[PDB]
Design a protein around this ligand. Structure first.
Ligand SMILES: CCCCCCCCCCCCCCCCCCCC
Ligand SMILES: CCCCCCCCCCCCCCCCCCCC
Ligand SMILES: CCCCCCCCCCCCCCCCCCCC
Ligand SMILES: CCCCCCCCCCCCCCCCCCCC
Ligand SMILES: CCCCCCCCCCCCCCCCCCCC
Ligand SMILES: CCCCCCCCCCCCCCCCCCCC
Lengths: 227, 228, 224
């Protein structure tokens, strides 16, 4: 409940501070540290909002949808994707090159979030699942870019940075896949799991995706940079 | 009306897939392919929303406003403008150079859309037209950047890429000008033409602007690259 | 109140036109001119909205959504210009982007959190959010004053002098906003809505119009 949101805020607020301090401030690593440190600060703001039910909509039938949660995802996810794109290019790209991939992957990712929110708010089952599927299509669009063309470039340019990108993407894919799963089985979908259970699961997921991943990604870059 | 939206979605969904696959994946062409392929995918999501009247607000005495339509325009138009800016610079610029023109042209363009939405929703005629005009001012702001300074740079840097930009801009101008015309004539404005007729017209316009233009722009760039 | 908004629109509309015309269209200066000219045009659109009470919420306490909408876009653009100055108009792939994203995220959050504080009808919540917004502002100020300023000075004296001058001016003016909020009807309600509105207009002109011309002069000094 409130306790989960307050735990989320505290973890995310501290983590953001920790990620920046601990993170490298040198050359290419710096801009990765800045991006990774920002995500939790957004998540923190979101979680603080959710504790006081700011942005949280209560349907006539007492059903709750957290706008703040989706608002977080709409900004954070793209920032995490942006960091990955830069890794793939090995921190060098000509005018418009990285920008094109960024725009492509952000558009898909943000749409994935927006469509997911439309699905959540949909009170008609048929519509709810049509939109969920479209969201999933967007997610596959994101995953395709990451796993095929971007990963292709990631490996082509060198083993060290290619190894770092592949490690980061793998971790990202598994964690990111939990969100659509939780949605499906959660109160926004099949309603197999309780609101509180889904919220508690998301907190654990959010910490892995934003905090653990950040420290993991830093180690993979630091290991790769050493070579 | 819903049939038009479903037709729009299907055309835009397929087109997006087609544009990416057909588009070149090499050097400067690649980043143009990625940007051009994204637009229809947004438009598609928008059109799907509109079929189920998701963003659609209904006001008495025949006033409908499709929020999803404007949401599409607020993202797509800038992406199309972004692609043009990159063309003008001949796919090379110093730090912040392209960014300055992007921010400038996006701010004007997005404002043009936002102001247009305010105009559509405005219940006082005087306000509705004040905002329409302000939107038009923004559009002129966009057109100025495209046609004067950006076109100047486009031609100065080389004939091949300059020819491609000029062709793309010309096509852009004519199509983009239809939107303010339809708005004026449409239920959002003078209510001279029916909601359904205006919606069907916009679908035709949207296909030209996002799908036909994409293939046209691609050909003009590939023509310029081969000639060079 | 409406007269202030109409005055704001007219000042901001003309200023934006003036800033572009007067601004240099060459090399690094150009992209600074384009960014600086756009800000007032946003502010203008905002002020026009506010005169006709578009985005203005009646709920007893009144909060101008158009005002915050303006701030959420303009402030980042002004911060973006400063970041570019610090790098001396040269940075490797992703370098400037990382600092931009960092400083924009903090800045935009600062605005949105401030809006949450304004809309909050419960005092305790209103001040929790105000403080969080302030934390974000300090986050912005830190980046500007420490790491970005460090790079600004390290790269050369001329551009380092220009950045330091611009930042100083920015900090002082930008600090008025949280002060006005605190003592204004969105906070302690020590000063009237009209007084706060008229004060913000004066502040907004300094921050977007005067600062633009000041920043332009400082860059032309640095280029010479
Ligand atoms: C390759 C250059 C980067 C393109 C940026 C695309 C701008 C997106 C506009 C979104 C505004 C809403
Ligand atoms: C460094 C330059 C990269 C900047 C990234 C640009 C990303 C643009 C953001 C796109 C957002 C699209 C999501 C909006 C969907 C709205 C569609 C309406 C459906 C109801
Ligand atoms: C929102 C309006 C301004 C968006 C500008 C984004 C352009 C990014 C270029 C680097
Ligand atoms: C040189 C590039 C300048 C980038 C400016 C982008 C402006 C970001 C504002 C978006 C925040 C909107 C929040 C609602
Ligand atoms: C909707 C939010 C999307 C914002 C993501 C923008 C991240 C940009 C990553 C930095 C790119 C810098 C490249 C410079 C060349
Ligand atoms: C060039 C990168 C600018 C993107 C700014 C990030 C927007 C964050 C929104 C909160």
């Amino acid at each position: 409940d409130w306790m989960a949101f307050l735990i989320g805020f505290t973890i995310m607020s501290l983590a953001s501070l920790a990620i920046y301090a601990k993170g490298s401030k040198t050359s290419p690593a710096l801009h990765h540290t800045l991006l990774h440190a920002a995500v939790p600060f957004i998540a923190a703001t979101a979680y603080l909002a959710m504790t006081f039910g700011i942005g949280t909509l209560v349907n006539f039938n007492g059903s709750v949808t957290y706008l703040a949660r989706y608002a977080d995802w709409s900004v954070t996810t793209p920032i995490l994707l942006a960091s990955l794109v830069l890794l793939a290019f090995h921190e060098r790209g000509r005018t418009g090159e990285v920008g094109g991939y960024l725009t492509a992957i952000i558009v898909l990712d943000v749409l994935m979030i927006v469509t997911g929110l439309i699905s959540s708010l949909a009170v008609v089952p048929a519509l709810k699942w049509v939109w969920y599927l479209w969201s999933c299509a967007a997610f596959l669009g994101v995953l395709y870019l990451l796993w095929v063309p971007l990963r292709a470039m990631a490996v082509e340019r060198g083993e060290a940075l290619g190894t770092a990108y592949q490690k980061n993407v793998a971790f990202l894919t598994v964690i990111w896949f939990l969100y659509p799963i939780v949605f499906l089985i959660g109160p926004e979908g099949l309603k197999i799991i309780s609101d509180p259970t889904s919220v508690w699961a998301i907190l654990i997921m959010d910490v892995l995706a934003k905090v653990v991943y950040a420290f993991y990604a830093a180690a993979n870059l630091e290991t790769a940079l050493r070579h």
